[PDB]
Amino acid sequence: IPTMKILIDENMPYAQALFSQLGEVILKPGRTLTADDLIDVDALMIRSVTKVNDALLAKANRLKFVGTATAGMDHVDQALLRERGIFFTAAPGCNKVGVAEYVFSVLMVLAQQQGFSVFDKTVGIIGAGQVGSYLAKCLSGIGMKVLLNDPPKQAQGDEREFTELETLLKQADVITLHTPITRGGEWPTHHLIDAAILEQLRSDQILINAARGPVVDNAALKARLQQGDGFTAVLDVFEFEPQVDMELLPLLAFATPHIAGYGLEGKARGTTMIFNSYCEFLGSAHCANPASLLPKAPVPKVYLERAWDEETLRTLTQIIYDVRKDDAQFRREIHQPGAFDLMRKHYWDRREYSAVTLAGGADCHLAPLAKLGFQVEVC
Amino acid sequence: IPTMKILIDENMPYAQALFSQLGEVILKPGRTLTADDLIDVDALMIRSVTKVNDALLAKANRLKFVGTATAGMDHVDQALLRERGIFFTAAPGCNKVGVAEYVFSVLMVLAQQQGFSVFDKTVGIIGAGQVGSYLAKCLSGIGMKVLLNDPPKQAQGDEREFTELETLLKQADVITLHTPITRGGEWPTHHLIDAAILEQLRSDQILINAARGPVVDNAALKARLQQGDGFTAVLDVFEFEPQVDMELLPLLAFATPHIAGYGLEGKARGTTMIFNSYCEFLGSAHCANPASLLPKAPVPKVYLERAWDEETLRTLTQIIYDVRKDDAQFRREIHQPGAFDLMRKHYWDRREYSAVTLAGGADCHLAPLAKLGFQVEVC
Numbered sequence: 001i002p003t004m005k006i007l008i009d010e011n012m013p014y015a016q017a018l019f020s021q022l023g024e025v026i027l028k029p030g031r032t033l034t035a036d037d038l039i040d041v042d043a044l045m046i047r048s049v050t051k052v053n054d055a056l057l058a059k060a061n062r063l064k065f066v067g068t069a070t071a072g073m074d075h076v077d078q079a080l081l082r083e084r085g086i087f088f089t090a091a092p093g094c095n096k097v098g099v100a101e102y103v104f105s106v107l108m109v110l111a112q113q114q115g116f117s118v119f120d121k122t123v124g125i126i127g128a129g130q131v132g133s134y135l136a137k138c139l140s141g142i143g144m145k146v147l148l149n150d151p152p153k154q155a156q157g158d159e160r161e162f163t164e165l166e167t168l169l170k171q172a173d174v175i176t177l178h179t180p181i182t183r184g185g186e187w188p189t190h191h192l193i194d195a196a197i198l199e200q201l202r203s204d205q206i207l208i209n210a211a212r213g214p215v216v217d218n219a220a221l222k223a224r225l226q227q228g229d230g231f232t233a234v235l236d237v238f239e240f241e242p243q244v245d246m247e248l249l250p251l252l253a254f255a256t257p258h259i260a261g262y263g264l265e266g267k268a269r270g271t272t273m274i275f276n277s278y279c280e281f282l283g284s285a286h287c288a289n290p291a292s293l294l295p296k297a298p299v300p301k302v303y304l305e306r307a308w309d310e311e312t313l314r315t316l317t318q319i320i321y322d323v324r325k326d327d328a329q330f331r332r333e334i335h336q337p338g339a340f341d342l343m344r345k346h347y348w349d350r351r352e353y354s355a356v357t358l359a360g361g362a363d364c365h366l367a368p369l370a371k372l373g374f375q376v377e378v379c
Numbered sequence: 380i381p382t383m384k385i386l387i388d389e390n391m392p393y394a395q396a397l398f399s400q401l402g403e404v405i406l407k408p409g410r411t412l413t414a415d416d417l418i419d420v421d422a423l424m425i426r427s428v429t430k431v432n433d434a435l436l437a438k439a440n441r442l443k444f445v446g447t448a449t450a451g452m453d454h455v456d457q458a459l460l461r462e463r464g465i466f467f468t469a470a471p472g473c474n475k476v477g478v479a480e481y482v483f484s485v486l487m488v489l490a491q492q493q494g495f496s497v498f499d500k501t502v503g504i505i506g507a508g509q510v511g512s513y514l515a516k517c518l519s520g521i522g523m524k525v526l527l528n529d530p531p532k533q534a535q536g537d538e539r540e541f542t543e544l545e546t547l548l549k550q551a552d553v554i555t556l557h558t559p560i561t562r563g564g565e566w567p568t569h570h571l572i573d574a575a576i577l578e579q580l581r582s583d584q585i586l587i588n589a590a591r592g593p594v595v596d597n598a599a600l601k602a603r604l605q606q607g608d609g610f611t612a613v614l615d616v617f618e619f620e621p622q623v624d625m626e627l628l629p630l631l632a633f634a635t636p637h638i639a640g641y642g643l644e645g646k647a648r649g650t651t652m653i654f655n656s657y658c659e660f661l662g663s664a665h666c667a668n669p670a671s672l673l674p675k676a677p678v679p680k681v682y683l684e685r686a687w688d689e690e691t692l693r694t695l696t697q698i699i700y701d702v703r704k705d706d707a708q709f710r711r712e713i714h715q716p717g718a719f720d721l722m723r724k725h726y727w728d729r730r731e732y733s734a735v736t737l738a739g740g741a742d743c744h745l746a747p748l749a750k751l752g753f754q755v756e757v758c
């Protein structure tokens with residue numbers, strides 16, 4: 001029987017098991033892919049390590065489909081793909097779930113450490129794409145007040161209610177960034193949080209940047225933190241990572257090596273999403289989800305005796321992710337050579353709220369917890 | 380129908396509900412009890428706020444039984460009680476459970492923060508009474524190596540295998556204190572951990588004192604910590620509490636205001652134990668337990684998919700108690716007037732491992748977790 005010839009990155013998780021259903025699978029390390037590797041190849045499945053150039057496709061005589069198991073697609077010349085009719089797809093938002101649960105962990109722990117309620121704090125989301133909109137969904141789901149800012153999408157006709165920047169920077173208690181890094185365009189994000197903005201940030205305001213490094217001027221962030229007025233900053237991304245300011249590090253409430261979106265589920269969605277895309281491209285009925293591929297969580301379900309309070313919410317969410325874990329490892333190991341990248345490479349088997357089932361009675365208020373991302377079960 | 384007349388401290392938890400089954404209950408604040416209050420009184424149930432003097436019993440014409448809902452009994456002249464035939468009982472070990480789970484939390488978090496395995500660390504218990512023996516049971520239950528030291532009990536004929544002090548101080552990684560505070564006697568405990576001992580403590584050794592304040596010379600503890608060689612100390616009790624050395628405080632890994640044994644269950648055991656004692660004293664069949672009196676825990680049961688690792692153990696135990704919570708509040712509030720005592724008075728609804736049921740399959744290894752204190756259920 002004739003089959004499609006599918007070239008796939010060797011280290012794409014669950015790739016062989018999934019795509020073998022769709023035809024002949026060739027597994028090769030993505031960094032060493034040459035032009036000859038695409039001879040007689042119908043479809044290509046890659047990660048970020050493979051650059052889709054003119055060079056790579058020089059002998060792609062059968063290439064009709066290209067899928068990248070990533071949320072981003074800068075490693076792909078998609079103007080090239082477009083001009084020669086090659087269908088292209090990524091996995092947008094494949095790792096957005098982790099970021100939301102990362103931000104929530106940060107809020108939850110800071111609430112405990114500084115002694116306040118998260119339901120008193122207004123979160124301002126700058127960047128309402130895949131990541132921001134999911135975070136906006138989760139926070140609003142449990143009844144927190146969100147503030148969305150997005151000048152590009154608002155100009156494109158997005159009819160969500162957007163808050164203007166200077167308003168958000170004043171009206172919001174917590175400021176979280178979820179934008180790309182851009183120097184040009186109508187709405188550049190390089191040093192979006194600059195010196196002038198930082199010094200107008202109050203002592204009871206929290207700044208979180210788990211978007212991209214250069215969005216926050218790290219030098220300016222340090223200067224703002226060295227006043228010691230109680231201003232609070234959390235960085236998952238650094239302006240010149242893997243290098244970080246070792247003077248700034250002990251001033252940051254939490255510091256982690258670009259691992260907010262990490263997690264087995266999100267990593268599996270990379271493969272899962274482009275697999276479903278290619279399935280649909282072939283006209284196949286096959287369909288896959290990360291829940292089916294992964295083993296069940298260590299603590300897959302817990303039971304609730306009554307309705308949840310803020311304390312129970314902290315208890316439940318920290319079963320999955322506690323930001324203090326990564327923070328501690330990062331500070332402990334960063335002095336070691338290449339520890340920034342090695343910590344990411346050997347990241348632990350982190351899950352997400354969907355891996356855990358919350359079982360309760362109709363009087364336990366699980367509907368907000370379901371919107372937060374948990375699986376629920378009314379007894 | 381004739382009944383026993385029972386005088387009880389107004390603020391003893393669940394006292395009226397329990398003891399009303401045994402006869403007439405009179406509720407009066409323990410600090411304001413006078414001699415006249417014991418006229419025609421058959422039994423007395425008190426806390427620490429009531430001092431049992433010659434003065435208090437001056438008109439106790441019917442007093443036959445005295446119960447104090449405490450583990451200690453220094454507030455009681457029991458030489459007086461003995462010489463006039465009054466049966467006396469306390470509630471020994473009523474709050475020992477919390478201390479063990481406190482110590483374990485400290486070990487669990489320090490293991491995460493410093494990056495090590497608790498199953499690599501040998502815990503040396505100094506003081507093998509109610510508290511120490513329960514801790515020894517819990518740690519050995521999950522497979523940790525314990526080291527018991529107790530010169531008084533060893534001299535009295537206790538045939539457990541005891542380790543000599545200087546040996547324990549060298550052979551053990553973690554040193555936890557669970558002794559009373561004594562200046563005299565054959566085995567005094569005042570400054571038991573002194574200057575000479577502290578300076579022979581290694582950089583990879585941990586010292587925990589949740590026993591009594593003056594057992595550790597706090598001034599010497601500070602001097603040892605100011606070297607910055609990596610030595611680690613945790614205090615639940617301070618030499619001159621509620622006053623603490625504000626120079627020592629930021630050097631302590633964890634600092635809490637004498638709340639290790641706190642928890643609803645332990646607090647209820649105070650009433651429960653002396654109630655059962657008095658029941659037995661009357662020849663009654665009535666019997667009570669704190670589990671029946673308390674509401675069920677917020678998260679009363681969780682399920683396990685597989686056997687537990689060290690990470691899962693941390694996840695499970697921190698559902699009940701996470702020492703970082705109290706530590707954060709203590710450091711945040713201590714500057715406030717009387718915050719040391721007020722934090723204890725308005726302590727949160729803390730539980731214990733027995734309040735949570737761990738459900739799994741026969742292959743989940745719950746037997747050690749049961750010995751740790753959890754309720755288990757093999758499916």
Ligand SMILES: NC(=O)c1ccc[n+]([C@@H]2O[C@H](COP(=O)([O-])OP(=O)(O)OC[C@H]3O[C@@H](n4cnc5c(N)ncnc54)[C@H](O)[C@@H]3O)[C@@H](O)[C@H]2O)c1
Nearest residue numbers: 127128129130131150152178179180187210211259260261
């Ligand atoms: N730290 C992490 O673990 C982690 C993980 C994944 C993604 N990210 C970062 O997520 C950002 C969000 O990712 P995404 O997948 O949602 O991409 P996205 O493009 O869907 O989202 C960003 C949103 O950015 C808006 N935007 C662009 N410029 C803006 C500006 N100047 N002001 C306000 N909004 C602006 C975009 O138009 C859109 O509204 C990127 O930096 C992404 O790489 C971080």
Ligand SMILES: NC(=O)c1ccc[n+]([C@@H]2O[C@H](COP(=O)([O-])OP(=O)(O)OC[C@H]3O[C@@H](n4cnc5c(N)ncnc54)[C@H](O)[C@@H]3O)[C@@H](O)[C@H]2O)c1
Nearest residue numbers: 506507508509510529531557558559566589590638639640
């Ligand atoms: N921090 C807390 O929350 C908290 C709570 C309850 C009790 N405690 C402290 O517990 C200590 C343990 O309490 P307990 O109820 O088990 O009392 P206990 O008398 O049963 O226990 C202490 C054990 O102390 C041994 N001991 C006395 N001197 C010793 C010495 N010099 N060296 C080694 N062992 C010695 C006693 O003989 C016994 O073996 C007391 O200080 C108790 O008040 C602390």
Ligand SMILES: [Cl-]
Nearest residue numbers: 014015016017
């Ligand atoms: Cl596979």
Ligand SMILES: [Cl-]
Nearest residue numbers: 071072073074
């Ligand atoms: Cl990108």
Ligand SMILES: [Cl-]
Nearest residue numbers: 393394395396
């Ligand atoms: Cl009562």
Ligand SMILES: [Cl-]
Nearest residue numbers: 450451452453
């Ligand atoms: Cl005492």
